[PDB]
Amino acid sequence: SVTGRIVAMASGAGRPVWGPRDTVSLMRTGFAGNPVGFRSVKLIAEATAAVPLICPVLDLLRRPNAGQGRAELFEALIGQILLSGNGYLEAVCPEPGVPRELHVLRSDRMAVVPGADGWPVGYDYTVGGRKHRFDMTGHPDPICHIKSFHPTDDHYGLSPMQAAAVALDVHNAASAWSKALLDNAARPSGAIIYKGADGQGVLAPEQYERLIFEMETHHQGARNAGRPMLLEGGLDWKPMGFSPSDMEFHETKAAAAREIALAFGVPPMLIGIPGDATYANYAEANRAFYRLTVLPLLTRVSAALAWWLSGYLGAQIELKPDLDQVPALAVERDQLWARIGAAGFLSNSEKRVLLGLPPT
Amino acid sequence: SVTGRIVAMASGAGRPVWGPRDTVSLMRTGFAGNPVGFRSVKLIAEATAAVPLICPVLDLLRRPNAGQGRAELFEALIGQILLSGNGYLEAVCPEPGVPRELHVLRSDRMAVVPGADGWPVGYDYTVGGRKHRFDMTGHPDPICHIKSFHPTDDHYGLSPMQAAA
Amino acid sequence: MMLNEVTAVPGTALPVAEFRDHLRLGTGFADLGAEDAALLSYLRAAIAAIEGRTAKALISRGFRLALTAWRWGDMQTLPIAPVATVTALRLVDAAGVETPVAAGWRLVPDMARPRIEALGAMLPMIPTGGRVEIDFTAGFGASWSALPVDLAQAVFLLAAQYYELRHDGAAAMPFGVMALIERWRTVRVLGGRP
Amino acid sequence: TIRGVLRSTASLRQIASVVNVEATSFDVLVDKTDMGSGWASETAALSETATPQIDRITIPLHELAAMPKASSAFDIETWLANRIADKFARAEAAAFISGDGVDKPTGFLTKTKVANGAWAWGSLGYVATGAAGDFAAVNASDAVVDLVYALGAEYRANASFVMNSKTAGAVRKMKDADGRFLWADSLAAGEPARLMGYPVLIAEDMPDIAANAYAIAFGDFGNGYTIAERPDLRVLRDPFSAKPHVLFYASKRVGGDVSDFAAIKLLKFAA
Amino acid sequence: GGYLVDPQTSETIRGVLRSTASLRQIASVVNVEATSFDVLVDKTDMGS
Numbered sequence A: 001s002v003t004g005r006i007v008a009m010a011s012g013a014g015r016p017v018w019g020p021r022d023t024v025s026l027m028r029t030g031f032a033g034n035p036v037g038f039r040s041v042k043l044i045a046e047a048t049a050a051v052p053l054i055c056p057v058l059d060l061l062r063r064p065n066a067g068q069g070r071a072e073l074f075e076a077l078i079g080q081i082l083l084s085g086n087g088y089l090e091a092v093c094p095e096p097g098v099p100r101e102l103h104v105l106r107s108d109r110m111a112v113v114p115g116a117d118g119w120p121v122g123y124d125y126t127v128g129g130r131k132h133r134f135d136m137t138g139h140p141d142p143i144c145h146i147k148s149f150h151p152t153d154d155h156y157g158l159s160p161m162q163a164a165a166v167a168l169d170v171h172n173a174a175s176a177w178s179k180a181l182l183d184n185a186a187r188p189s190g191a192i193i194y195k196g197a198d199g200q201g202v203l204a205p206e207q208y209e210r211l212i213f214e215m216e217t218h219h220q221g222a223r224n225a226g227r228p229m230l231l232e233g234g235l236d237w238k239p240m241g242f243s244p245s246d247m248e249f250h251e252t253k254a255a256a257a258r259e260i261a262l263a264f265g266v267p268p269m270l271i272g273i274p275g276d277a278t279y280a281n282y283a284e285a286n287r288a289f290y291r292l293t294v295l296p297l298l299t300r301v302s303a304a305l306a307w308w309l310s311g312y313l314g315a316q317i318e319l320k321p322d323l324d325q326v327p328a329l330a331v332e333r334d335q336l337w338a339r340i341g342a343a344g345f346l347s348n349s350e351k352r353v354l355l356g357l358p359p360t
Numbered sequence B: 001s002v003t004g005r006i007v008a009m010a011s012g013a014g015r016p017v018w019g020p021r022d023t024v025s026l027m028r029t030g031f032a033g034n035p036v037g038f039r040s041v042k043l044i045a046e047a048t049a050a051v052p053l054i055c056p057v058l059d060l061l062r063r064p065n066a067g068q069g070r071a072e073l074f075e076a077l078i079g080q081i082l083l084s085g086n087g088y089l090e091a092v093c094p095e096p097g098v099p100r101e102l103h104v105l106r107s108d109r110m111a112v113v114p115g116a117d118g119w120p121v122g123y124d125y126t127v128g129g130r131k132h133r134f135d136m137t138g139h140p141d142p143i144c145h146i147k148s149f150h151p152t153d154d155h156y157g158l159s160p161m162q163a164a165a
Numbered sequence C: 001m002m003l004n005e006v007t008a009v010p011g012t013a014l015p016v017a018e019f020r021d022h023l024r025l026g027t028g029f030a031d032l033g034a035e036d037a038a039l040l041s042y043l044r045a046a047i048a049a050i051e052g053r054t055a056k057a058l059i060s061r062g063f064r065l066a067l068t069a070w071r072w073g074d075m076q077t078l079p080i081a082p083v084a085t086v087t088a089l090r091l092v093d094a095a096g097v098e099t100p101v102a103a104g105w106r107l108v109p110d111m112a113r114p115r116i117e118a119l120g121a122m123l124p125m126i127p128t129g130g131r132v133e134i135d136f137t138a139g140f141g142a143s144w145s146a147l148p149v150d151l152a153q154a155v156f157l158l159a160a161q162y163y164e165l166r167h168d169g170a171a172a173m174p175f176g177v178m179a180l181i182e183r184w185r186t187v188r189v190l191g192g193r194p
Numbered sequence D: 001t002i003r004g005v006l007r008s009t010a011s012l013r014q015i016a017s018v019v020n021v022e023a024t025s026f027d028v029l030v031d032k033t034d035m036g037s038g039w040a041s042e043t044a045a046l047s048e049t050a051t052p053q054i055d056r057i058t059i060p061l062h063e064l065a066a067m068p069k070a071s072s073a074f075d076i077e078t079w080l081a082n083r084i085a086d087k088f089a090r091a092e093a094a095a096f097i098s099g100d101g102v103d104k105p106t107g108f109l110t111k112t113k114v115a116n117g118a119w120a121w122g123s124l125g126y127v128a129t130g131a132a133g134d135f136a137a138v139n140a141s142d143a144v145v146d147l148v149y150a151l152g153a154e155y156r157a158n159a160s161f162v163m164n165s166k167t168a169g170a171v172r173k174m175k176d177a178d179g180r181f182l183w184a185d186s187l188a189a190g191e192p193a194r195l196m197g198y199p200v201l202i203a204e205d206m207p208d209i210a211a212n213a214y215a216i217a218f219g220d221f222g223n224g225y226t227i228a229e230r231p232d233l234r235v236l237r238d239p240f241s242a243k244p245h246v247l248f249y250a251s252k253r254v255g256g257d258v259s260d261f262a263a264i265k266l267l268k269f270a271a
Numbered sequence E: 001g002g003y004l005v006d007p008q009t010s011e012t013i014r015g016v017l018r019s020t021a022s023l024r025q026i027a028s029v030v031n032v033e034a035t036s037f038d039v040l041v042d043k044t045d046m047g048s
Helices: A003-009 A023-030 A035-048 A057-062 A072-082 A165-183 A205-216 A250-264 A285-292 A293-309 A331-341 A349-355 B004-012 B025-028 B033-050 B057-062 B072-082 C016-024 C034-052 C147-164 C177-181 D076-098 D142-148 D165-172
Strands: A086-092 A099-104 A110-113 A122-125 A143-147 A191-194 A234-239 B086-092 B099-105 B110-113 B122-125 B143-147 C061-065 C083-088 C132-140 D017-020 D026-031 D054-059 D061-065 D124-128 D159-163 D198-201 D214-219 D225-230 D234-236 D249-258 D264-268
Touching: A023 A072, A023 A165, A035 A072, A035 A165, A035 A250, A035 A293, A057 A072, A057 A293, A072 A099, A072 A293, A086 A293, A143 A293, A165 A250, A205 D165, A285 A293, A285 D061, A331 A349, B025 B072, B033 B072, B057 B072, B072 B086, B072 B099, C016 C034, C016 C147, C016 D076, C034 C147, C034 C177, C147 C177, D026 D225, D054 D249, D061 D076, D076 D249, D124 D142, D142 D214, D142 D264, D165 D198, D165 D214
Parallel strands: D017 D225, D124 D264, D159 D198
Antiparallel strands: A086 A099, A086 A143, A110 A122, A191 A234, B086 B099, B086 B143, B110 B122, C061 C132, C083 C132, D026 D054, D061 D249, D159 D214, D214 D264, D225 D249, D234 D249
């Protein structure tokens, strides 16, 4: 905070700081463009919305606004964090405490203002040429700004799609390689070469319609596969091939489809990409998914809702994921109940306090 | 239903709507032609006929008509749904309640009529140049029309053979 | 796409008096005897052999390019390469109402790929059946002196050959006829849909 | 981050009456004259004293358009959107002050000015300074103070000066017979921003001091000048017309002239 | 006072009414997606 004043002047106080320009184009080319970048965010954002929470405040979260439910809110919230590294939540307060409206402001059209002491004073929702200038020079601070970790930038997040932005363009263009190869390719199944007495000679349109009708009827198609095809003088049939037949950038697409899944943190088994068996039997890969890239993400966002929404209340509230009755963690729950349940030496109430039960 | 009147006028009320022409040719080229398309429908239609049902009404289903048993009926019924996306069941009622005849009308020769409010008023069994014009402007509505899901069409089914054509 | 010439050369524009000098001047039998109007008939045969291999025009004759459908959305490369000033882009309909247009297109001149390249993305659409028709003047200059002289020498190396030997008789020069033409041929590598 | 030249931002938008309008035009309705009531006589007819003739002034609500062609270090979509909003904030400022009638809002300077004391409704009133080149030589700022006190006490509750930078320069250049800077006395003060108890708006589209130019205005522009506009800004992110250049289309529509001819008073630098 | 008062307009831009009978009602239409359609008729009958 003491050094906060020094970085603020360099950027320029009172003026909007934009950060990354090409953020909106990674969405259309990397999330609406390829299925791997599409499925990876949809797999996470529909997983963090499904996790229950532990606190009143959750009555706001259950019904944030019209037409945007509890689970639909976090899909919009985490879906901006995975896409552009930043999450925004406007609170509309007709009432003084616990404001009854939440709105995920998209992070394409939002810009920060550094202000005096380096910590932000303005946020600017910029649609068309129109700005809004939300104000942070107050106590309730009407927008929570959830940052992904960015080491070099002081105001935004890193957005894992930016780290995979080369592997998206490999997977977008290798998939479009095979598309435009199926659309721009002339393979013939042969060529009836007609030289003539000279090195060059055309055949007359009388002879040419004769050549079609014996080729149309008697030689093409499945039903004429293999006629013995008499070739008189001058004529010759050179059959062409198609030498790379399968596998046009097949492994570099399948390797880039795994590096996209690597950056968002989904395992290759969940998304459905082919590859070597790393995880075994989905009791691991679903448990690894909710432990390395979902529950760390959800306990970081819920820790920002636990502090931003407590600024509207008087008492501070904690708000964490449940990490109980989330059915992907049952292999960590069998393993912990059967450990203490088999420990017969310590008594009955001495293990209800370990497994989390109210003792009797 | 409130929007039903708007789509009906575009198609043209009182006039038969046919849908897919080449439906009869996918049967001869895809179900009488190759064993994989042959076995796949016969594997399903002989499986749905074997499943018992839970309700009187099933006395009709057990003996629908002459020469066409209970299990033979659903093979004809599901065998039209898998082939052309549409199932049809004519009920002949000499008696007022629980009509004692069921007949699977084949969906090659059946055509819909959109009617006034978008929901159908006529079905046309068209063999040769001969029509019949079944009427849906009544309460018993003598033909059940089972649709497979079709997102783009408003009157027929999608027939998985068309997706594998 | 018929692309007939509107008018041919006058004949008096051709260098018949100069071609007699390329035939035998400074060395030779004398001026000798040459059927003058014969020598004009070999220049028109050597130019029309180099107008075809190079797709150039060389005398700046008037053309009429009447084609039915536009190939691209807007581009319309013109075949005869050195162009200047579209005379008119009149547009006839299936009956022959012949309604010209005067704006919407800007000819972009170039020796490589002359174009029509309309403004924006809208090039004048075609009446159904009513072929579009483009009149233009393509070539280097009105007189023989306005030509690139290396291309003019390829005419004189070729028109003298049709004068020196009549039938197709057999006979590797460094800059022959073929080596002077190749920097004026059209180098294309598209066999595709656009 | 790509930089640009920083232009003036003060635009007469924050002191004039900004009205969100949705139709094609905005019609303000001002009566031109008084009721004309007289003290009645005890034995007289006493009928039809008078009626204020009303007048509709039409804000035409013109449109403003700028059309640049776009032709990964800095991102054009955000930067060009932050430049064209500045240009639409600055190009309407010239129309609000010295715009003419054709296709653009007519500024308050283009309204057929008449010398004050012979002031009628259809015009704006001015006060003369003296010599034609500049302020008066004998007593400077007398033109400024009687410009203030020749307006009307009801509009001077919230009125402001409108100048450009180098007319406020020539105002701060005024000095007494010892040279002690009548406005902001020391060389350590700065812009005092409260000329004659009233705020100053440095609007660069005002003319400078010339032979007859009206370089200083003063008024309650909340009643005087009505800016009727639509708040949005059109954003056609065009992916057609030219493959090479995006050629974004951005437009804001805005109109305005004077609603009240009594609010604004001008300073003519002449005799 | 004449500028003070403004007229009330209709709720819908209305038009002259023209006929709807079109022979589309009595001819037979086909839901088709193509560039051409080819009916198949029999000009004459077989000799018997």
